[PDB]
Design a protein around this ligand. Structure first.
Ligand SMILES: C/C=C\C/C=C/CCC(=O)[C@@H](O)CC(N)=O
Ligand SMILES: C/C=C\C/C=C/CCC(=O)[C@@H](O)CC(N)=O
Ligand SMILES: [Mn+2]
Ligand SMILES: [Mn+2]
Lengths: 331, 331
């Protein structure tokens, strides 16, 4: 009768399985710079924007022409093994990546066809920049909590090889200006990789990690500056999380944050007073893997044995929109 | 304790408002053919594939460079007027179109920024070829039924002007073959338009039309032939609808079908024995408006006064994937 925050949390949703793929090919910003060196000179910038401003040593790329669906399929296979279940159990598959095979059909239907889902499995894509994986988890959770399905797959594969090729080669043309060159430059922090998660009704997977859900706030009036507005949005979203999830910063055990740049992380951790030891980071070697960053970090934590039963894990993203979501997992 | 179909239907979800935009510029297939006539000759095809095989007289195009977000925004404004509510009531906005402004941010966040949504409004895109509008209605319904929100906007704007321009001009090049030309040709059945819907909790809008929900089946192994497999998927989806919604063909008052081609409609209506008078059609003058087709047809029905309290309306789509969804509205 009387609402309270805790009421809209999910009670019967768990994480049954989780996997990630690291893309194989390391590319350093050293190599990239040396390719860029003559156009650094030409325009006359002595600053190493990548290594020094952004703090990115290197990112990973695919070795072949891997399509988003290919990478998601691979991660999906691993996550079904992690969960110990066959594909015939899956009732929903959502694809959440920014990289997409086609305008249509959906990338989800391609991954579904690859894995061999049943004729009962519902499939669609969600797009929301870096927050989409959290969006897809929530959409699946609502079907699970209702009892419409028993298992769901949320997948995300990212490719940046073609982005680099076009952009690297603009940023060595004689006809490029500075406002041009500086804009294009952000393209070169992006990285490749993939992640997948199997979610389930908790009674099917007793004592699996629990997905409680979370909150979203937006500042779509905004669809130096991005950083400031991002932090302000995140502060407001943190209040909403206090109100629903009962969060205090000191009671949380990990912060799984979308992975952008050393300054952006720095600003985030200071502004909320977080112990940086509770914020695993991968941008400096993997670059920014977009919406796949969050589950990839969570999967790496699990695998390095860094999580334990009862840990409170905060998943959080600030994304173009602007949008900000925060959700809790209890390991 | 014991499941039954009716259990997973929505009890507290209504349609509060509905609007469509027709794109202004008529283009006939006559004109298009006369532009194509010399390359009909060259390859030596005496068949009028558009007018005779597909049955499309004409489609509508935008007069200016209208972006998907622009068209959705317009339809959205109309639907909020239809519903008699301000944008500050909206807690969710989902964009379901195939046409997209950017890889990111989401088209939804752009429409949201245009309308002026509150900082509480969650926004994201869904992509699933022609079925997405039905997918977005269902996603919103689950949030509404739970009580997470009170009002949602589902929007869809489609643009095809640029598709035509590139394609028309391939299909007049000297270097085009027949397998090429025939493939490209399907591009020219597509049309422009937009639709928006306001959904709400039923107690907020007493005696509004009721959204019950529906069912989905897939044949993603398939991600002349498409037609046959489509009908077979639809027949299986109809069985699922019988099992959940209790459908019989004769008990339904309208069939709101995604709008493809005269043969595809024909095959559909015969295979299920539907009275063609219960299947409003717009493809012959508007072409195929993709996922916007369904709500656009529903909006036209309402406006021509063709629906009455208690009418059972079947929304149905067969889409690339292959996927098939069917849902019920009770007017
Ligand atoms: C501090 C606020 C900024 C963090 C947000 C991320 C911006 C840089 C990116 O990584 C974007 O691609 C994220 C996105 N598109 O949603
Ligand atoms: C009879 C089965 C075929 C009907 C399906 C539609 C195919 C033609 C189109 O209109 C596609 O664009 C639909 C789609 N992409 O989901
Ligand atoms: Mn290599
Ligand atoms: Mn005109």
């Amino acid at each position: 009768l009387v609402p309270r925050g805790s009421h809209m949390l999910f009670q019967n949703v768990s994480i049954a399985g989780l996997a990630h793929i690291d893309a194989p090919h390391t590319l350093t910003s050293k190599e990239i710079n040396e390719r860029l060196q003559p156009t650094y000179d030409r325009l006359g910038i002595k600053t190493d924007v990548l290594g020094d401003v952004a703090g990115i040593h290197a990112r990973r790329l695919w070795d072949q022409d891997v399509q988003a669906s290919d990478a998601a399929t691979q991660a999906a296979r691993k996550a079904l093994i992690d969960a110990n279940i066959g594909i015939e159990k899956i009732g929903l598959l959502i694809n959440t990546s920014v990289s997409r095979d086609y305008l249509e059909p959906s990338t989800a239907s391609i991954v579904s066809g690859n894995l061999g889902v049943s004729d009962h499995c519902m499939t669609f894509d969600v797009a929301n920049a870096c927050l989409a994986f959290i969006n897809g988890m929530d959409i699946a959770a609502r079907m699970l909590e209702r009892g419409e399905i028993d298992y769901a797959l949320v997948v995300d594969g990212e490719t940046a090889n073609l982005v680099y090729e076009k952009t690297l080669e603009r940023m060595t043309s004689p006809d490029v200006t500075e406002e041009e060159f500086r804009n294009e430059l952000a393209a070169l922090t992006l990285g490749c990789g993939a992640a997948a998660m199997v979610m389930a009704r908790s009674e099917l997977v007793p004592d699996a990690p629990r997905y409680k859900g979370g909150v979203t706030r937006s500042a779509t009036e905004w669809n130096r500056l991005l950083l400031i507005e991002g932090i302000k949005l995140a502060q407001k979203t943190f209040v909403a999380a206090k109100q629903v999830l009962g969060w205090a910063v000191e009671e949380l055990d990990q912060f799984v944050i979308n992975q952008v740049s050393r300054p952006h992380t720095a600003a985030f951790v200071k502004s909320f007073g977080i112990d940086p030891a509770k914020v695993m980071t991968i941008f400096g070697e993997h670059g920014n893997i977009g919406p796949a960053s969050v589950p990839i970090v969570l999967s790496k934590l699990k695998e390095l044995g860094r999580l334990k039963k009862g840990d409170r894990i905060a998943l959080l993203g600030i994304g173009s929109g602007l949008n900000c979501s925060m959700a809790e997992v209890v390991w």
